[PDB]
Amino acid sequence: VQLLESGAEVKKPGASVRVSCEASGYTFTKYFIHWVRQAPGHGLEWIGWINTLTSGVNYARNFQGRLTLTRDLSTETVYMDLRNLKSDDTAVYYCARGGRGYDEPWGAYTWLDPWGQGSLVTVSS
Amino acid sequence: WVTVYYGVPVWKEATTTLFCASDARNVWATHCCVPTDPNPQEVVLENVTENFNMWKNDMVEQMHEDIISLWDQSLKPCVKLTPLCVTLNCTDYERGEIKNCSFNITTSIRDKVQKEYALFYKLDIVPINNSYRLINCNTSVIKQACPKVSFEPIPIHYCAPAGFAILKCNDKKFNGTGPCTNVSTVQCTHGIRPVVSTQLLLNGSLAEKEVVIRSQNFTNNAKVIIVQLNESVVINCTRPNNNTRKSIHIAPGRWFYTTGAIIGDIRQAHCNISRVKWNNTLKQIATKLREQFKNKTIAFNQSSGGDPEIVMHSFNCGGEFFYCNTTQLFNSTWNDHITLPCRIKQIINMWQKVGKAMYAPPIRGQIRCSSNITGLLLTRDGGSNENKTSETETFRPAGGDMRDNWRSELYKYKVVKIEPLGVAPTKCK
Amino acid sequence: WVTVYYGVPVWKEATTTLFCASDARNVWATHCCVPTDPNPQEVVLENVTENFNMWKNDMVEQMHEDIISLWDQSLKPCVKLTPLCVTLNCTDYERGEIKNCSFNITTSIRDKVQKEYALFYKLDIVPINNSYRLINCNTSVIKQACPKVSFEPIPIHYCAPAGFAILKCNDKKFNGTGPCTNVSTVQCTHGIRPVVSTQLLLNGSLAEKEVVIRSQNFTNNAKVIIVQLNESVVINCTRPNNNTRKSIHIAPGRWFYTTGAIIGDIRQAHCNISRVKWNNTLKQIATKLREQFKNKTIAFNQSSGGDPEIVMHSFNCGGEFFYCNTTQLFNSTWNDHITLPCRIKQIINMWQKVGKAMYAPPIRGQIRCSSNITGLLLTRDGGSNENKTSETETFRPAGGDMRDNWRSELYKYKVVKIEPLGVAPTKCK
Amino acid sequence: LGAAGSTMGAASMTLTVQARQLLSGIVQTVWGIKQLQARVLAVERYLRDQQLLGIWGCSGKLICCTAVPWNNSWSNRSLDMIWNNMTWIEWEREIDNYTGLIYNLLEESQNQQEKNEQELLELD
Amino acid sequence: LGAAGSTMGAASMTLTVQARQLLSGIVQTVWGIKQLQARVLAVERYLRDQQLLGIWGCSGKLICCTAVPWNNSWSNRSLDMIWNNMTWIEWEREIDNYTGLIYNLLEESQNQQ
Amino acid sequence: SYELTQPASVSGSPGQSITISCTGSSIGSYDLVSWYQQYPGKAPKVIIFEVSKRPSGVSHRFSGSKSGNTAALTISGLQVEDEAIYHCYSYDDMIIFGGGTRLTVL
């Protein structure tokens, strides 16, 4: 099972970026997709997730009102729409499978086996 | 000595296809079921216990598969709308809520083109100037629902086949998992009405004594919390915008029906909820959540779902498909009338499948709809920066997984197989 | 006295319908095949002699009909490529093996014309200057196989329905017909992979001890001789070419998948054959033929002609259909490594059905499959030379009749019906 | 059918009462297939029990005599401990891995050997 | 299934061993239809035999006493020649010629007369 | 929380058995700290599933530990190929990651 991220991008502060991930080998609607970013010097930061079936979402408080996640069922593709980008947001963004599966007591968690390559988004003046 | 006893009162958990029993067009009003209802009274099983798990209940899985299958069987032979996939020339006839589109259609007569027009909700069209095209034209096949088919759900009772029985929890305060102490056996479930909705559960059953909250797990915030109310709330929904139908000869021996005209002024669909009944209901829900989380503070917020069926409340009134704005409802904090505008759409990606798109017909504009709120689907939001200002827990509307609508009614039932034959030691022979 | 005995262990030959079973989206999906039970128990029937006939075996006929039906069930709902049966503007880029063709598609959004291009193999192109057309697009409906489904063969265990039993012949060196003295009863077959090929039989079972050659009648030169090897030879076939993928929308949710570009240079498909193993294989086959034929001389002499699929060795590696030039393997004689070029095609006249065709969408490249040669299909020329130069018997590859691919494996099995009643003399009231 | 929580002895006193059969029906194309399959299987299950009772030499009588001794590999629990200290459900679980064995034994003695003995009486 | 290759005497035990409903068992739209049809037919065959046995006065009998004396034209041999020599397969092949006659006689003697 | 207090770095010779830990306190309520391994230029992969279960494809050198507030990773028989950054994953009603431990091989 593989995930494929879009390429890297460079933005100015007060900007927006659209990052996509394509999934293959495992039916898209059977699992949650989580987004995480790697910010060198800080380790990893969890951002949020999308259900992919019901498109329910959950985000960290520091992204409220700024990040929207969506999905296209017909292409088994997930998108990260992030607005009002700051230099603070320079990081490598990844999609990573989420948990074991939707129909499981702890299904949204404990797994994260598939991942992508990641996509660096640089924000700089 | 080993002897044989037949008619032994034992069973094992098992699954089997259940029978559809009706109360007395009408596919969800069971035109294809039988009213097998000879006063099927229950027997109480005395001093037995049984393990129930509503989250692993195959009866829910059957409702899902059966309703989808029946839906498709009923609409399979209806008119394809492929001939309408042309660039449309559209104007603003709120700010253009309804578009007036004209187009070149070439299918009823192979060597001719006709000019046709239709009035329809902007929510179903893609801007491409006055150039537009229908939103669900590409990637999916759209069929118009048949004018002689209706989906007006009635309570449906599911019955075990001979050799099987349905066990039921009669326990109060049953949380959906673990053992039940008061267990009875019924041949058939009570009638459960196959109502389709998202954020709020409509026209279902009520809790016997108090608002109760069930979840597979309460620390896993990825789970949907099912809230069952012990009192109904009645909602008055209407679309007073009067209209008339235009019949378009789309394909040979095939007719398409669209809105031909708007009669009177422009009005939008709206729903009326008692202000007080709603805020008192939330107080009760919040109370139960406070018990679950040892106080903290309960707050209600917006769905933030992205996807319109999730974002807005998805509501079905005959052939009228509503997307109601509920941000006026889920806006409160609990630390101890209201009119919702509704959007109307005619293309439905029913069951969230690509290729199953359906087009609702006109219903001559005017409609009155009156429904009962019996429960809610909510999701938990918290855990971010737990170290500081973490005393409040937020709940938001949740929905879209149809199996929750059925789970919320079928949670008290289990199917078992009767195994009447067995042996035991004796002195005989 | 005519006493009636019930449960009498006798049977009669009978034909019934076997069911699919497997060990595990794909063809031979688990939803349509029962999980195979571990260790079905084989029971040896002592002092039983049973007459077998591998060429009259209805199990073979059944595999043929069922594999075809299943194949069609999978392709039935897939994309028609009829919008593409147009005159092509096409030139080049082994030489001009692959060409860059272009066309005007008027159906992608259903009201616009767009010039599109795709790369094609010349074997799928009709010359008609730079004017070309898709092969047989004007005689048959060509459908693209759905990319969501794997057609990779897995062993299938065919099981008897209740009331029936399968008799398996375990005799060593058993030929195609006649009495078998080591007969056992089984519930299901051992698992046969539904592999489709022509000249050479791949991934089958092996004979024990010696190569066994079976034919309904060796004297009748119109019959195909099935050669079952007792050791396999593994061949590594590859399509080392590298490419990109392209999707050309041609209809609603109806898109054509093709090759967008060549990465680097063009390299034809090739197969790795051990020279030594092949030569040894032929020597032992020739030896057995020298036993069957009166110390006549054994020769192989390529192919007499027929459909390209017969002339060349046909097989399917992943989703790519190979047609290998095997002339290097079949021109030798006895009276006492190796690399083959391969061609690739995308339009397949699957199962030889008139008016139907299948299109194989491409894959990215660098694909290799290692396959086991387990047997050969051969025919005799015989010739008319009896008075002069009568000393040499020539064999050639044969194939195309799918029933031989299953006869080669099902030859050990027979289906019979259980007949529990009978009577016999005794003494009684 | 509420006697399941009662002891084996107590419940057996009502096998006749609870021998409801539940075979006769009332109110006498994919849904059609599913329901047809359900009806066919219900018949098949019925017949399996009847065939099994017949092969063991049972007349349909709710409690059959036997020709097979009970032994300690199955259970060495005393009879009061089985009949008055347990329910039928618990009992079935306790001896569940011997079902195949016992059934084969019931057949071999009570009906296979017994019928052979009856033939000998007829020969005489 | 079982010792088919054994004398009929030996097979008197085999006889009852194989009298299982081998016409029924547990497995777990075209393929579904084909198998459903097969299952229905298996049921009919089972019942056909049970019904025929009831007609002949045989019910729950693996070895059923008749009211018809053996007719020697039906490959007489001897009792030891069959019970201690021929298998059931061989025996039935010789008796196949009289099957209709035998069945008609069994019904009339045991129940109708 | 953000209590998965991983050591900035660890080291040892080839063949050495080593321990990496983060010992956050919010373990017991989920009963879970899983582990990941990240290579330069690559996404992290699962080395420990749930608590101390080995994923398919993962070396037998890897095992873990949970006890009270203990959360640890054990790498027995350290190889050069194991040079990587290791991370603790936990769910304190939220996904929390440790900063990560840089493991080098001497």
Ligand SMILES: *[C@@H]1O[C@H](CO)[C@@H](O[C@@H]2O[C@H](CO)[C@@H](O[C@@H]3O[C@H](CO[C@H]4O[C@H](CO)[C@@H](O)[C@H](O)[C@@H]4O)[C@@H](O)[C@H](O[C@H]4O[C@H](CO)[C@@H](O)[C@H](O)[C@@H]4O)[C@@H]3O)[C@H](O)[C@H]2NC(C)=O)[C@H](O)[C@H]1NC(C)=O
């Ligand atoms: C609805 O209400 C019911 C109660 O009526 C709740 O049911 C209980 O749920 C908990 C949590 O899942 C269950 O706890 C489990 O107990 C097991 C031990 O059971 C034995 O020992 C205890 C000793 O006190 C006896 O009481 C009991 O009868 C048994 O003899 C543990 O083994 C379980 O897991 C632990 O150990 C394993 C070991 O392999 C670890 O892997 C696990 O991670 C963990 O450490 C677990 O702790 C409890 O048994 C349930 N009660 C009943 C009667 O079934 C429902 O949870 C509640 N539902 C909701 C939604 O709130």
Ligand SMILES: *[C@@H]1O[C@H](CO)[C@@H](O[C@@H]2O[C@H](CO)[C@@H](O[C@@H]3O[C@H](CO)[C@@H](O)[C@H](O)[C@@H]3O)[C@H](O)[C@H]2NC(C)=O)[C@H](O)[C@H]1NC(C)=O
């Ligand atoms: C254990 O579960 C059983 C089954 O649900 C409970 O019995 C049921 O009790 C209700 C009353 O609460 C009965 O409903 C009403 O009864 C009155 C009086 O006869 C009648 O006039 C009403 O029209 C209505 O039927 C219900 O019939 C009865 N069910 C059965 C099968 O007897 C029982 O009370 C529960 N016990 C505990 C401790 O929870």
Ligand SMILES: *[C@@H]1O[C@H](CO)[C@@H](O[C@@H]2O[C@H](CO)[C@@H](O[C@@H]3O[C@H](CO)[C@@H](O)[C@H](O)[C@@H]3O)[C@H](O)[C@H]2NC(C)=O)[C@H](O)[C@H]1NC(C)=O
């Ligand atoms: C949802 O799943 C979680 C995780 O499996 C369950 O968590 C359990 O919660 C209880 C109460 O908080 C824990 O009990 C106590 O934990 C402390 C930890 O410091 C310990 O010192 C005590 O002796 C006692 O064990 C329990 O350990 C914890 N579970 C582990 C595996 O499960 C939660 O209860 C589940 N909720 C529902 C509604 O199912």
Ligand SMILES: *[C@@H]1O[C@H](CO)[C@@H](O[C@@H]2O[C@H](CO)[C@@H](O[C@@H]3O[C@H](CO)[C@@H](O)[C@H](O)[C@@H]3O)[C@H](O)[C@H]2NC(C)=O)[C@H](O)[C@H]1NC(C)=O
């Ligand atoms: C539903 O959730 C949203 C998102 O958490 C809540 O909105 C948030 O409300 C707080 C308090 O009004 C805002 O705080 C402000 O932050 C700015 C930061 O520059 C500061 O300068 C102000 O003095 C103040 O502290 C917060 O920004 C706002 N978040 C967003 C994304 O707009 C909303 O209140 C919740 N509603 C309910 C009913 O729970």
Ligand SMILES: *[C@@H]1O[C@H](CO)[C@@H](O[C@@H]2O[C@H](CO)[C@@H](O[C@@H]3O[C@H](CO)[C@@H](O)[C@H](O)[C@@H]3O)[C@H](O)[C@H]2NC(C)=O)[C@H](O)[C@H]1NC(C)=O
């Ligand atoms: C293919 O089928 C044919 C039958 O259609 C088999 O024919 C057999 O051929 C041999 C060779 O001629 C015959 O044997 C001898 O024939 C001479 C004739 O003059 C006779 O004098 C000898 O005493 C001896 O019978 C054999 O009788 C004949 N079979 C029959 C039934 O007539 C042929 O063997 C089959 N080949 C294979 C490989 O199965």
Ligand SMILES: *[C@@H]1O[C@H](CO)[C@@H](O[C@@H]2O[C@H](CO)[C@@H](O[C@@H]3O[C@H](CO)[C@@H](O)[C@H](O)[C@@H]3O)[C@H](O)[C@H]2NC(C)=O)[C@H](O)[C@H]1NC(C)=O
């Ligand atoms: C068809 O492909 C197979 C591979 O799937 C080829 O077999 C491989 O041949 C190589 C070269 O002889 C073997 O390499 C040896 O590996 C051992 C490892 O211990 C090493 O000590 C030797 O010095 C040598 O490097 C390789 O093991 C073998 N693989 C397998 C699975 O057998 C085969 O030769 C190809 N056939 C043709 C006709 O090219």
Ligand SMILES: *[C@@H]1O[C@H](CO)[C@@H](O[C@@H]2O[C@H](CO)[C@@H](O[C@@H]3O[C@H](CO)[C@@H](O)[C@H](O)[C@@H]3O)[C@H](O)[C@H]2NC(C)=O)[C@H](O)[C@H]1NC(C)=O
């Ligand atoms: C039976 O015949 C087949 C075909 O000639 C033999 O080759 C096997 O072909 C499949 C399909 O292409 C290979 O699986 C694929 O592997 C790639 C790896 O990158 C993966 O991306 C695809 O999704 C798919 O899983 C399979 O590896 C290949 N096997 C070998 C040894 O080359 C097959 O070996 C023959 N024998 C048996 C026992 O099946």
Ligand SMILES: *[C@@H]1O[C@H](CO)[C@@H](O[C@@H]2O[C@H](CO)[C@@H](O[C@@H]3O[C@H](CO)[C@@H](O)[C@H](O)[C@@H]3O)[C@H](O)[C@H]2NC(C)=O)[C@H](O)[C@H]1NC(C)=O
């Ligand atoms: C066909 O040959 C190509 C070689 O040109 C094989 O892989 C290709 O590798 C390059 C180099 O990494 C990829 O280009 C770029 O790589 C950087 C990372 O170094 C990445 O950041 C860029 O976004 C971009 O991917 C190139 O995309 C890749 N080509 C393909 C088709 O994946 C290719 O694997 C060979 N085909 C087959 C079937 O093996």
Ligand SMILES: *[C@@H]1O[C@H](CO)[C@@H](O[C@@H]2O[C@H](CO)[C@@H](O[C@@H]3O[C@H](CO)[C@@H](O)[C@H](O)[C@@H]3O)[C@H](O)[C@H]2NC(C)=O)[C@H](O)[C@H]1NC(C)=O
């Ligand atoms: C297949 O045929 C063979 C040969 O007839 C059967 O083997 C043996 O057959 C004899 C009867 O001919 C059985 O009876 C006993 O023979 C011994 C000989 O030493 C004698 O001392 C006894 O008093 C008695 O007459 C013998 O048990 C049997 N042997 C075995 C190992 O079975 C064989 O049974 C036949 N297969 C089947 C399935 O019936």
Ligand SMILES: *[C@@H]1O[C@H](CO[C@@H]2O[C@H](CO)[C@@H](O[C@@H]3O[C@H](CO)[C@@H](O)[C@H](O)[C@@H]3O)[C@H](O)[C@H]2NC(C)=O)[C@@H](O)[C@H](O)[C@H]1NC(C)=O
């Ligand atoms: C058959 O009915 C039984 C009801 O009678 C009593 O029920 C209580 C539980 O409510 C049993 O346990 C007690 O639990 C208390 C609270 O934990 C303790 O303080 C007390 O000391 C005691 O342990 C009590 O034993 C039981 N009485 C008798 C005579 O059994 C019910 O318990 C059974 O489960 C029920 N059986 C079935 C199969 O339904």
Ligand SMILES: *[C@@H]1O[C@H](CO)[C@@H](O[C@@H]2O[C@H](CO)[C@@H](O)[C@H](O)[C@H]2NC(C)=O)[C@H](O)[C@H]1NC(C)=O
């Ligand atoms: C439909 O197409 C017509 C052209 O056939 C458009 O009508 C003209 O558009 C131009 C450019 O904007 C204007 O200058 C003319 O005054 C328009 N003529 C009329 C009679 O309106 C028309 O706008 C298109 N769209 C709709 C909704 O009618």
Ligand SMILES: *[C@@H]1O[C@H](CO)[C@@H](O[C@@H]2O[C@H](CO)[C@@H](O)[C@H](O)[C@H]2NC(C)=O)[C@H](O)[C@H]1NC(C)=O
């Ligand atoms: C429906 O349930 C609610 C609780 O969710 C009941 O509310 C009661 O309200 C009174 C004050 O008016 C309190 O004194 C009670 O303690 C509350 N009861 C509970 C269980 O919380 C409400 O009465 C119930 N409705 C009906 C018709 O029974």
Ligand SMILES: *[C@@H]1O[C@H](CO)[C@@H](O[C@@H]2O[C@H](CO)[C@@H](O)[C@H](O)[C@H]2NC(C)=O)[C@H](O)[C@H]1NC(C)=O
């Ligand atoms: C499609 O047809 C066009 C028109 O005949 C071809 O265009 C010519 O290509 C040659 C080179 O091969 C140029 O020298 C001419 O000048 C082009 N003609 C014009 C009018 O520009 C085109 O090559 C054909 N393409 C294919 C793939 O067959």
Ligand SMILES: *[C@@H]1O[C@H](CO)[C@@H](O[C@@H]2O[C@H](CO)[C@@H](O)[C@H](O)[C@H]2NC(C)=O)[C@H](O)[C@H]1NC(C)=O
């Ligand atoms: C698509 O259709 C256009 C016509 O609209 C074709 O172009 C013509 O080709 C002929 C022959 O070379 C020329 O004489 C015309 O002058 C061209 N017309 C125009 C407007 O350019 C074009 O070749 C077709 N393309 C394909 C791939 O089939």
Ligand SMILES: *[C@@H]1O[C@H](CO)[C@@H](O[C@@H]2O[C@H](CO)[C@@H](O)[C@H](O)[C@H]2NC(C)=O)[C@H](O)[C@H]1NC(C)=O
């Ligand atoms: C067994 O039954 C047959 C049938 O009745 C008896 O043979 C018949 O004899 C008459 C003349 O009396 C012939 O016309 C029939 O064609 C004969 N039928 C057959 C099948 O042979 C036979 O004699 C009886 N044998 C014994 C020993 O009782």
Ligand SMILES: *[C@@H]1O[C@H](CO)[C@@H](O)[C@H](O)[C@H]1NC(C)=O
């Ligand atoms: C139909 O096509 C013609 C093309 O010349 C265009 O002028 C006309 O406006 C189109 N009509 C409609 C209703 O789209």
